[PDB]
Design an enzyme around this catalytic site. Sequence first.
Site, PDB file in Angstrom:
ATOM      1  N   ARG A 106       4.875  18.232 -14.849  1.00  0.00           N
ATOM      2  CA  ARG A 106       3.825  18.727 -15.724  1.00  0.00           C
ATOM      3  C   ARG A 106       4.376  19.393 -16.974  1.00  0.00           C
ATOM      4  O   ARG A 106       3.756  19.354 -18.014  1.00  0.00           O
ATOM      5  CB  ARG A 106       2.843  19.612 -14.967  1.00  0.00           C
ATOM      6  CG  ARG A 106       1.853  18.818 -14.114  1.00  0.00           C
ATOM      7  CD  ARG A 106       0.715  18.212 -14.955  1.00  0.00           C
ATOM      8  NE  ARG A 106       0.191  16.969 -14.388  1.00  0.00           N
ATOM      9  CZ  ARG A 106       0.728  15.764 -14.594  1.00  0.00           C
ATOM     10  NH1 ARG A 106       1.803  15.605 -15.364  1.00  0.00           N
ATOM     11  NH2 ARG A 106       0.192  14.689 -14.025  1.00  0.00           N
TER      12      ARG A 106
ATOM     13  N   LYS B 128       4.468  16.594 -19.129  1.00  0.00           N
ATOM     14  CA  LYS B 128       3.127  16.314 -19.626  1.00  0.00           C
ATOM     15  C   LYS B 128       2.865  17.033 -20.947  1.00  0.00           C
ATOM     16  O   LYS B 128       2.710  16.377 -21.981  1.00  0.00           O
ATOM     17  CB  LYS B 128       2.046  16.658 -18.612  1.00  0.00           C
ATOM     18  CG  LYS B 128       0.744  15.929 -18.865  1.00  0.00           C
ATOM     19  CD  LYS B 128       0.959  14.421 -18.928  1.00  0.00           C
ATOM     20  CE  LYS B 128       0.377  13.718 -20.160  1.00  0.00           C
ATOM     21  NZ  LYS B 128       1.159  12.513 -20.615  1.00  0.00           N
TER      22      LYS B 128
ATOM     23  N   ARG C 213      -0.563 -20.265   6.825  1.00  0.00           N
ATOM     24  CA  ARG C 213      -1.131 -19.033   6.340  1.00  0.00           C
ATOM     25  C   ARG C 213      -0.385 -17.871   6.947  1.00  0.00           C
ATOM     26  O   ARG C 213      -0.146 -16.880   6.290  1.00  0.00           O
ATOM     27  CB  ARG C 213      -2.603 -18.952   6.696  1.00  0.00           C
ATOM     28  CG  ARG C 213      -3.400 -18.029   5.806  1.00  0.00           C
ATOM     29  CD  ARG C 213      -4.064 -16.937   6.615  1.00  0.00           C
ATOM     30  NE  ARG C 213      -5.504 -17.100   6.640  1.00  0.00           N
ATOM     31  CZ  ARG C 213      -6.303 -16.500   7.505  1.00  0.00           C
ATOM     32  NH1 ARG C 213      -5.798 -15.689   8.408  1.00  0.00           N
ATOM     33  NH2 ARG C 213      -7.604 -16.709   7.463  1.00  0.00           N
TER      34      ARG C 213
ATOM     35  N   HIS D 138       3.223 -13.123   7.998  1.00  0.00           N
ATOM     36  CA  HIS D 138       4.002 -12.472   9.024  1.00  0.00           C
ATOM     37  C   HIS D 138       5.465 -12.602   8.801  1.00  0.00           C
ATOM     38  O   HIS D 138       6.258 -12.383   9.681  1.00  0.00           O
ATOM     39  CB  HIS D 138       3.628 -13.013  10.385  1.00  0.00           C
ATOM     40  CG  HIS D 138       2.215 -12.739  10.757  1.00  0.00           C
ATOM     41  ND1 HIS D 138       1.551 -13.443  11.715  1.00  0.00           N
ATOM     42  CD2 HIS D 138       1.329 -11.858  10.265  1.00  0.00           C
ATOM     43  CE1 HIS D 138       0.322 -12.992  11.819  1.00  0.00           C
ATOM     44  NE2 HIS D 138       0.161 -12.034  10.941  1.00  0.00           N
TER      45      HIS D 138
ATOM     46  N   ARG E 258     -14.033  -5.609   1.531  1.00  0.00           N
ATOM     47  CA  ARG E 258     -13.019  -6.592   1.823  1.00  0.00           C
ATOM     48  C   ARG E 258     -13.669  -7.947   1.849  1.00  0.00           C
ATOM     49  O   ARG E 258     -13.343  -8.804   1.076  1.00  0.00           O
ATOM     50  CB  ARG E 258     -12.284  -6.282   3.126  1.00  0.00           C
ATOM     51  CG  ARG E 258     -11.718  -7.487   3.868  1.00  0.00           C
ATOM     52  CD  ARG E 258     -10.705  -7.123   4.913  1.00  0.00           C
ATOM     53  NE  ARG E 258     -11.241  -6.996   6.258  1.00  0.00           N
ATOM     54  CZ  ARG E 258     -12.143  -7.794   6.787  1.00  0.00           C
ATOM     55  NH1 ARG E 258     -12.644  -8.781   6.085  1.00  0.00           N
ATOM     56  NH2 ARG E 258     -12.541  -7.595   8.022  1.00  0.00           N
TER      57      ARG E 258
ATOM     58  N   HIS F  98     -14.020 -13.345   0.164  1.00  0.00           N
ATOM     59  CA  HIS F  98     -14.766 -14.587   0.296  1.00  0.00           C
ATOM     60  C   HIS F  98     -15.269 -15.122  -1.043  1.00  0.00           C
ATOM     61  O   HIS F  98     -15.990 -16.130  -1.096  1.00  0.00           O
ATOM     62  CB  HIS F  98     -15.907 -14.386   1.276  1.00  0.00           C
ATOM     63  CG  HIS F  98     -15.436 -13.897   2.606  1.00  0.00           C
ATOM     64  ND1 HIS F  98     -15.917 -12.747   3.195  1.00  0.00           N
ATOM     65  CD2 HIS F  98     -14.477 -14.377   3.433  1.00  0.00           C
ATOM     66  CE1 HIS F  98     -15.286 -12.552   4.340  1.00  0.00           C
ATOM     67  NE2 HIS F  98     -14.414 -13.532   4.511  1.00  0.00           N
TER      68      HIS F  98
END
Length: 1215
Positions: A365, A368, A521, A526, A1110, A1115
């Site tokens: 800061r 800042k 996918r 993964h 989500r 979608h």
Amino acid sequence: GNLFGHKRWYEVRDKKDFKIKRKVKVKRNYDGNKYILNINENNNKEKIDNNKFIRKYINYKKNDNILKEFTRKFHAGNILFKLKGKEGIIRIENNDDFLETLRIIENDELETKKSIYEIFKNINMSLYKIIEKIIENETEKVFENRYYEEHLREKLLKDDKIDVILTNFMEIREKIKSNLEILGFVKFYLNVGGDKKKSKNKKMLVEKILNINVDLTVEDIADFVIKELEFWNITKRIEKVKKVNNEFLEKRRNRTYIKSYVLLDKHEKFKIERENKKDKIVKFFVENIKNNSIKEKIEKILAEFKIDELIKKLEKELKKGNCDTEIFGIFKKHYKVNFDSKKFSKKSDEEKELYKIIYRYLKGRIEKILVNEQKVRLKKMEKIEIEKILNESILSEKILKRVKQYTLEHIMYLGKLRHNDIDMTTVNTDDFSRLHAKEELDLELITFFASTNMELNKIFSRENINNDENIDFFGGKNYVLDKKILNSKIKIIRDLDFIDNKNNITNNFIRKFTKIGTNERNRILHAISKERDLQGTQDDYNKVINIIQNLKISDEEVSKALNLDVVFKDKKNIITKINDIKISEENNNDIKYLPSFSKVLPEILNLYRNNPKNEPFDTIETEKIVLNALIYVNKELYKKLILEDDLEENESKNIFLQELKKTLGNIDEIDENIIENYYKNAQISASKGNNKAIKKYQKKVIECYIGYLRKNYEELFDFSDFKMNIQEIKKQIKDINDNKTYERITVKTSDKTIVINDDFEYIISIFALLNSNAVINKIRNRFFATSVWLNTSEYQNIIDILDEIMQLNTLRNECITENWNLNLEEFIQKMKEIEKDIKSKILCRIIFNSDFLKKYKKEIDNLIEDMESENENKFQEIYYPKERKNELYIYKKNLFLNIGNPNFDKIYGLISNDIKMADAKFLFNIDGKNIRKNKISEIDAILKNLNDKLNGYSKEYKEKYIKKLKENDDFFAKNIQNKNYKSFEKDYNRVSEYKKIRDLVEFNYLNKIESYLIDINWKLAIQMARFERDMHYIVNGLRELGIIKLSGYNTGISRAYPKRNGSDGFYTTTAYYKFFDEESYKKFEKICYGFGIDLSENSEINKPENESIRNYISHFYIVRNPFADYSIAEQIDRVSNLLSYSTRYNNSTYASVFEVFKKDVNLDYDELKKKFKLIGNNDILERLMKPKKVSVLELESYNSDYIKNLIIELLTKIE
RNA sequence: CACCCCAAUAUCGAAGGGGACUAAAACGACAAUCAAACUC
């Protein structure tokens, strides 16, 4: 400044002459186990000793280079004017000026100039002295600061002889200003000037001097001085290093430096450190956050800090008026008094970190305000006060959030290591960067999977009456066809063997496509990892259907002559010359790096118009019909010239690539693969924050190609003879249907070799075949950007593929609309299509759909139909002949194309009424017809020159020069035309008024709106995908530290978190990871809630269907169903909050979105840096966006208000 | 309101610096305000 940057501060002696000192940029490179220092120049990559280096850095930082330097570059009489002599003396003041001393012109008399010569020297000499004294000041006070240049400026401006100089310049100006044309010619001349080497900075200060139309302020001169002083790297900052008492403490000092600067980084610290100390603090922190023990733990320490006195302590200095680093002292000093000491105290390590975290936060800061004070002193920041940067209540909230970030980053870092499986012992910077590259590709790929699922939802719907919910094809099985299928789809779907006869669903779709898509996918998600894996599913026969599908789409070249070779029948000759070019399909690999033809197109356009000879364009038709043929040929010529193989031995000519490599590289050294290295260097620059990096390189490649076009294909734009038509229309028709005379000139059309090598290339190519050109484009270029960054050839095939699927998509759209149709007798065509319910006629009509045509006719009719007696000629020849009305329909392609498009009816509103009003002066007025031919460009040409003349000048200067141009008509007259400015202003608004109407009547707004929907929804899509990725990091991290317990993997579940759908064992059933007992999940959900992630249903994510942010975004319901239920703004708000668990992402969403509109509004970036919710209240909020300006000048854009409000409507509309 | 990281560090002229390692930007098929003197 920078080390390991673009500033060259490190000094190495020159090889040719040892005495000469040459300056170099130096860098950090990971050698394997440790960072090492290499010099970083194309010429030199030598290793640097850490010890030599650190000393040089410290030595560099305190060197009083400046005085020797200022004198070394400059001497009085060379400082500006170069009014010099001295009879063999190199530099001196006042003496020894040698005072009072292809066509050659000598005249009598010009006595006065001799008077002004002296004026030069009184000018230059005063200046050199003014600077020397200031440099001579002492410490100096001036150069010991971080914003040293500014201090120099204030000192220069204030209370100095400079003002007399202004007077002298003015005096010099006055004689030139009126009395002698020669005086100006001369007064300017005694500047070096033009030849050797000179700084743009100087030329502009000259250009202000030689101009009496513009006022000269003392500010302009000072600004020149510092810029010249930096320009030559005379002026640097003097910063003293930490004081040290003997060699042994100097040794210690230089060692921590080498650590801080050369040796370690996030990874390096992680590797050495530190008997498990970090994990303990983080473990310590997570619990405290869950407990809620934390806030007072911080809130108390803050008071230990005693901020209020500090605010007072700080305030005192700022008035001291330096506006600099001294602030850190007052902070450093303040801590010493209020805090220990060392006795206080021996404390827990976890406790100590809250002190460091707090300390260094508040030291942030202190930056800042300092940044602000510099940012208020110049122009406006403006004028913010400390008082409420320190705000102990605000600080308490901010400090807490920084503690969760610390605790979070560490967890994620371990998780990221874990989930990937990078070894914790060798983590390095080099691996992390190439992991970023894919991580970026991975986000794109997953979003891609999620648009194809949106596409598949439209084609396929659940069998049952009961569920209208989304079908997750990948990661999922008795589907039945959707009611609302396009029937464009069935043909593709049928071809793929997805659909059995009668439209019943195929066996293959269930294993071949769905099974592969999901396994694929999940490799992405993964971090699998393995053999990939299908021995496996997918076979050439399976694949061959895909290849054969792609091959089918392309129209044959013979067909694609509806660009009328009538045009080229002159002129037949060039076309054979092009086909005659021989190219090899090797692909070279240079080609990847060159601009898209889309980039080069405009210049190609630009030249043909720019070329003097070409005649005015009749109506249009013609121009549409002349350019289009020309563009396509150029598009295919762009490609043949690049792929041309080396010429035979007896040609003088240079193949295009060879000229290009020669231009980009220095002479006599043309033996290189330089194209790639320029793109790769330009791509890295972009990375480090130079956004023009890639355009600047591009335009070089273009310039060189445009050259090459002019030198070898001049005739292709040389059109001495042409006619406005109809004669051409006759020509095409008379030519058309002389079937016996079948042959038409054609371009080569290349050949097609699509090949698939993996299951991955085949799900993608399929996916490509399933959704829009705009979408396949985004992941193509991401395939590209990664391959280059990682320097791999994995992806090159799918790129070529994705390219082909696209050029085939947009060519088929050339053929069918203009040529197969439009029938132009729409009521008839609908019955011609209904009867219907490679080749161009002919079958591509599949795209033509009866319902769409009916809609197309109906909407146009609505525009045409008169209200009351009031009727209209307007819209004549735009939507109808001519004659007349319903007999024929004009093909407004922009309208016809798309109308996919669940959206279209909703999207169209807010265009649709506005279309009706516009008068067609298009048409309408000879002035209107006139505006296009002579004048849209007339302004562009005029703005261009003004921009070019202006650039690099300050805003303050541009503003007056611009006022002076408006104010004085005689001054304005030279540039550009139609003097004065008032006359120009009216032609500008005239074109501004042509373009407004034009955009509506071809419905260019559909394109802009349709684009906004996909981009916004796409970035928002990326972001839910980032969130999903993060949870894997949170789980893995939480597990890696022993804070949570997992007993399994539920492979084949993509998501890392589980639903409460349960009922029981949901926790070991719902998610990819398996949790031991509720406690595990109950603990997980709680630690998560600590970070702002609400995992308990229904919490934004889990609301049942399309109620979660989500699900709504992922979608793709901003492209398919806009305005239903929720404001786009409502949702932009609701993701910007879902991501509020990680300060890194702060205003990530907001920024992301509004850059979709950067091109067509004037985003206030300052006000996009602040906190806000658009959706609620904040009516005032945009504000975020301001109306667009151009002419710089800043003239209001042809569609500035309309487009900006169009956007506003779009976001907010909620019905 | 960017964010993370770098010490002998709770704190020490880090009043410094790193960051494709992190967001944003950028990229994106069809589609615009930003040595000296001598040689010229």
